[PDB]
């Protein structure tokens, strides 16, 4: 066995922690919560995983570290009762992470790469959401049935091209920082058209002006016709908000400055149906017609602190996939505690610096545009990139398509290993495999469980379920590291310097509080199920 | 043993089938779906239960009919594998039916009896729903903790006053029919104020007129001030829909006629946010301000056929609670098949005649008012009653409060009987009881599971879950009546004239199709769970 700390523990952790939400939902989170509460979300979500890594270091520095996987380490160091729960919650987390990584790639393909490749269209006037959901479901079934046949046939080709999907992530992050440094000197040009406080969708109309001049004559623009329903300049059929207020362009990226970071510093939560608005603009109060409501950037979902925590939390998960090479290492009780902790530190520094960067460079109206309606249907992340916005689009699409394949290769192996362990004979038929050892019936069950997450068809609806499963897994790891100390069991003597039972209790309580924060209802259901299984045994 | 067919089988079935949805969601269903599709919903939902009663008659006409409950009949006539599934699905159905019956009584109390007894108020302008949900949850916890202490202390007093809650239902139905016959000759006076096609909420403004006369002077009314935001008659700040259109009262109950039944005959489905509108009125097309949108009757939820089936279906359930007295009967193989089938026939005739009655008497704009906003916050059912609308309000409130108590007494006995059977030792601690035999730990588990249904806080959100559990129970009964015939098992010779295996197959397929109709997602999850338990055994 010869695998270092770098290519054995650190690089798979750093490949599994970075993902879809850094490129799709982090600018929206900064713009919705403010820089201060966004740093609070990043700090709270990166203390569950740091204390969980301190507990996994106490797992790794005990005994012999049996070869293969993180399931076998926990199962041989903590008994079959805790290990089965950890393995089952981590299997369910990986199978729904595959669904979230597929839905991210479909969102990138349908809203940024190929917009006219849409089957279902928003008929009528309103409900542009049901066509979006039915459009996500069809491409979800197609990409899931393709990427399960790829895993069924081409495991060696997925394992051979596993570092290319990490190179894509690193290039598409260095482009963000290279453009964010350029914006100090030479910011790019993305004009945002507004009307009073309200920002409007630039994709529909042509020119951001109330009147224009053609043939030495003042003619009402296309923007006049959407609000007043006549090409005549002296009608009284206009809404009184459009009449009293003036139409103004602003720079969507004003560059890195202190006055920009000062305005993006506080929370601006909106309910579903509200319009994204500035604060430092004059606006005359007047009622507005209901028929001009599609001519604005509108909050898609209702937001709060507890909504944003549950959407952010699957950015930080990925500790447990740095112990999968625990048989190939030279010194497995040295490479795992150093590697997982340094990977969590570097990824959390990237998240803090990116929160401060997006808060100081991009203006909060562009930040609060989920799907980028204020700027010509572009990525808000992509507008800040240095060479072109297409770098982040292509790199994020290939990174999500790679992270879905790696989850669809990682979860059937885990169900294979749990079934072959005879720990629950109810799953005995899922230990059947090929002559290679590759699973056959576990891959089908992962494709069926990840289909139930695709049929939810939203990134923001699937992500709290992922938070709910990974927080249960990380809670059982901290339970199993505190109980074995407090019960004074034999064969539990961790040789790790920075381990103490109070840190595992603190991690258990923190990953229990985040369970109530992300979604209180299903946490209250899982608490009943867990309190019932305890009354059994 | 001496119990007849009438007081032993027929009256408990007829007490358990009638309930909350006949008085709260049936007029809304008629107005939303039309008379033809409402009769289709009633006909489809009353063929799952009729074929399920034909299968329960084949259960009852086999063997000895062991004493006590419907669980023991199925468990001794079909084996412990089918019987455990039937008993567990029927237990979960009864524990969520208690939650639906509590939420119905809270809806009646907060919207019709005591409106100012509300803790949470709709602050701001919009979101009158979140205050409503948080207002349902608090009174749900209060009424659940009261009606579990009543069941823990006063079982004999709940059993002594069980016929009073049936007398309330029968009086409050005979009042509906007595007023619906009066409306042929002398219809009551409930004026509905409208403005073009759109109907408005009468509870806010005073007089249904655009201008009025005080002191020999024409003065703008209170209804003018809500739409134009000025008491001056010559302003141009009005919305152009209010200016071009005229304000008109109609009779909310025009009486039983053929021209009224002809207009309520077709479907009018609305999406969330649409305004309830007539069809036979002139209306000038004009845009409308967003700030006048609370001055209208608005569809609360989006409706379709599959939404209304899942809300109607728990009106028909209640077959299985006519075999609870199977030890007290004289001829249990005669009283059960006659009693359950005659009770299903009489309740289904009441539903068909009530659909035709509400379609022919009440106008469809009043029918499509869920919560009765068009007529002064009254029950749409209650406006048709003969003596007063308070009869239906008080009778429906006491009937839902009684049907919640009877579910909270029926489900702990079932969990008691399943736990004492040693069929699943995982539930062994729930067979502990008092010295009387009354359960202690099963009553707590019913209070905890019915709390998870109360915290959903909607009648229309809890009702498809009830449909999902009762359709699984009725599917397992038809499976277990077709498999024992087709496998040619011994000790299965039903002596019922009208039984055949094709009727049980037809009932199984119909109660499987309704499972996909009511909610396709959770049916698709339950199909995976059932197909996995089959791959185990
Ligand atoms: C050990 C062995 C391994 C395999 C196995 O066990 C044995 O493992 C277990 C694990 C099981 C799974 C455990 C958990 C599960 C999650 C569960 O979802 C619960 C709720 C969510 C799903 O929502 C549903 O989504 C469907 C599809 O949309 C809806 O159906 C609708 O579909 C159509 C639309 O066209 C229409 O008819 C209706 O809309 C409806 O029928 C369901 O209704 C819906 O419940 C998460 O959804 C939640 O939805 C909320 C919306 O109200 C949302 O709130 C917010 O919504 C928006 C944000 O988008 C905002 O406006 C507001 O902020 C909020 O309103 C919530 O965010 C969101 O959480 C499904 C089952 C599943 C997967 C288990 C399956 C079995 C399992 C794998 C077993 C196996 C056997
Ligand atoms: C044998 C032994 C006995 C005991 C035991 O096992 C062992 O038995 C089992 C049985 C288990 C139970 C099985 C089933 C269960 C149902 C499951 O619910 C699934 C979905 C529904 C719940 O929705 C959730 O409701 C909560 C509360 O609202 C939401 O949380 C929200 O709360 C706040 C609000 O302030 C806010 O933060 C967010 O809103 C959110 O956090 C959840 O998000 C939500 O998922 C049904 O809800 C569905 O919601 C849809 C809305 O999107 C709705 O679609 C339609 O919505 C409206 C209609 O109102 C319309 O506009 C449209 O037409 C649609 O959008 C759907 O109609 C609706 O179906 C919960 C678990 C439970 C009870 C199991 C518990 C465990 C159990 C008892 C075991 C035990 C151990
Ligand atoms: C929108 O912008 C215009 C600028 O064109 C403001 O118009 C005022 O115009 C008069 C004469 O045209 C000037 O003397 C004033 O100085 C302008 N006011 C300013 C610059 O504040 C108009 O008031 C603006 N609308 C607003 C602020 O609601
Ligand atoms: C944007 O402008 C509006 C008025 O042009 C600001 O004023 C609010 O308007 C709403 C109407 O939707 C009222 O309910 C509020 O009471 C108004 N607030 C006041 C007068 O302080 C609105 O605040 C502005 N948006 C910002 C600053 O984010
Ligand atoms: C609303 O109702 C009024 C009735 O007061 C309609 O007014 C018209 O008024 C003129 C003179 O006042 C009459 O000669 C017409 O016969 C009326 N038209 C009718 C009765 O159709 C007014 O047109 C109505 N608004 C509509 C239908 O949009
Ligand atoms: C009620 O009146 C309106 C117009 O006063 C009718 O017309 C529809 O108006 C909507 C605007 O919300 C348009 O989108 C439709 O195209 C109009 N339909 C037409 C012109 O046929 C509306 O149909 C009426 N409602 C009814 C009859 O239920
Ligand atoms: Cl991610
Ligand atoms: Cl992980
Ligand atoms: Cl009912
Ligand atoms: Cl029933
Ligand atoms: K991740
Ligand atoms: K019922």
Swiss-Prot record, chains A, B:
Post-translational modification: Phosphorylated, phosphorylation may regulate transporter activity.
Residues given in the record as K(+) binding sites: 16-17, 101, 314, 317
UniProt effect for mutating residue 21 to A: Decrease in Cl(-) efflux
Tissue specificity of this protein: Ubiquitous. Levels are much higher in erythrocytes from patients with Hb SC and Hb SS compared to normal AA erythrocytes. This may contribute to red blood cell dehydration and to the manifestation of sickle cell disease by increasing the intracellular concentration of HbS.
Places the protein is found: Cell membrane
Residues reported in the UniProt entry to bind chloride 1: 318-320, 474
List of residues binding chloride 2: 474
Highest taxon, organism lineage: Eukaryota
Ranges in the topological domain labelled Extracellular: 27-34, 111-133, 183-304, 359-389
Glycosylated sites: 130, 197, 216, 232, 246
Segments passing through the bilayer: 5-26, 35-57, 82-110, 134-156, 157-182, 305-325, 336-358, 390-416, 440-460, 461-483, 498-520, 521-536
Disulfide feature: 193-208, 228-238
Residue numbers on the Cytoplasmic membrane side: 58-81, 326-335, 417-439, 484-497
Effect of residue 107 to A: Decrease in Cl(-) efflux and reduced sensitivity to KCC inhibitor VU0463271
Quaternary structure and partners: Homodimer; adopts a domain-swap conformation at the scissor helices connecting the transmembrane domain and C-terminal domain. Heterodimer with other K-Cl cotransporters.
Function description: Mediates electroneutral potassium-chloride cotransport when activated by cell swelling. May contribute to cell volume homeostasis in single cells. May be involved in the regulation of basolateral Cl(-) exit in NaCl absorbing epithelia.
Family as reported in the entry's similarity comment: Belongs to the SLC12A transporter family. K/Cl co-transporter subfamily.
Name of this protein: Solute carrier family 12 member 4
């Amino acid at each position: 066995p010869s695998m270092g700390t770098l290519m054995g523990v650190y690089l798979p952790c750093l490949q599994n922690i970075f993902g879809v939400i850094l490129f799709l939902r982090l600018t929206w989170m900064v713009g919705t919560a403010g820089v201060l509460q966004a740093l609070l979300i990043v700090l709270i979500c990166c203390c569950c995983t740091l204390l969980t890594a301190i507990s996994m270091s106490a797992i790794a520095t005990n005994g012999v570290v049996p070869a293969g996987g993180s399931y076998f380490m926990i199962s041989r160091s903590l008994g079959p009762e805790f290990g089965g729960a950890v393995g089952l919650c981590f299997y369910l987390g990986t199978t729904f992470a595959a669904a979230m990584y597929i839905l991210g790639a479909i969102e990138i393909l349908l809203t940024y790469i190929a917009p006219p490749a849409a089957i279902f269209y928003p008929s009528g006037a309103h409900d542009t959401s049901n066509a979006t959901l039915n459009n996500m479901r069809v491409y979800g079934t197609i990409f899931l049935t393709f990427m399960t046949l790829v895993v069924f046939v081409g495991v060696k080709y997925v394992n051979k091209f596993a570092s290319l999907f990490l190179a894509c992530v690193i290039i598409s992050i260095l482009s963000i920082y290279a453009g964010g440094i350029k914006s100090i000197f030479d910011p790019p040009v993305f004009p945002v058209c507004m009307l009073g406080n309200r920002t409007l969708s630039r994709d529909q109309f042509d020119i951001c002006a109330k009147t224009a001049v053609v043939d030495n004559e003042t003619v009402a623009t296309q923007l006049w016709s959407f609000f007043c329903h006549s090409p005549n300049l002296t009608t009284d059929s206009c809404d009184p908000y459009f009449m009293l207020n003036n139409v103004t362009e602003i720079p969507g990226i004003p560059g890195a400055a202190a006055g920009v970071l000062q305005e993006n510093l506080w929370s601006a939560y909106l309910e579903k149906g509200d319009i994204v608005e500035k604060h430092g603009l004059p606006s005359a109060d007047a009622p507005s017609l209901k028929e001009s409501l599609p001519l604005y950037v509108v909050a898609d979902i209702a937001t709060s602190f507890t909504v944003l925590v549950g959407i952010f939390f699957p950015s930080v998960t990925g500790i447990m996939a740095g112990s999968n090479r625990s048989g190939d290492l030279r010194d497995a009780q040295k490479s795992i505690p150093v590697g997982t902790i340094l990977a969590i530190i570097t990824t959390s520094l990237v998240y803090f610096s990116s929160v401060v960067l997006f808060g100081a460079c991009i203006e909060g109206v562009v930040l609060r545009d989920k799907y980028g309606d204020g700027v010509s249907r572009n990525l808000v992340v992509g507008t800040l990139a240095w060479p072109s916005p297409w770098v982040i689009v292509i790199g994020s699409f290939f990174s999500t398509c790679g992270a879905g394949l790696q989850s669809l290769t990682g979860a059937p192996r885990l169900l294979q290993a749990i079934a072959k362990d005879n720990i629950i004979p109810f799953l005995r038929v899922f230990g059947h495999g090929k002559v290679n050892g590759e699973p056959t019936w576990a891959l089908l069950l992962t494709a069926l469980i990840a289909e139930l997450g695709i049929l939810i068809a939203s990134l923001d609806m699937v992500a709290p379920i992922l938070s709910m499963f990974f927080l249960m897994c990380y809670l059982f790891v901290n339970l199993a590291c505190a109980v074995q100390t407090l019960l004074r069991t034999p064969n539990w003597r961790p040789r790790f310097k920075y381990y103490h039972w109070a840190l595992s209790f603190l991690g258990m309580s923190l990953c229990l509080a985040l369970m109530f924060v992300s979604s209180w209802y299903y946490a209250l259901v899982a608490m009943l199920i867990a309190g019932m299984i305890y009354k059994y045994i």
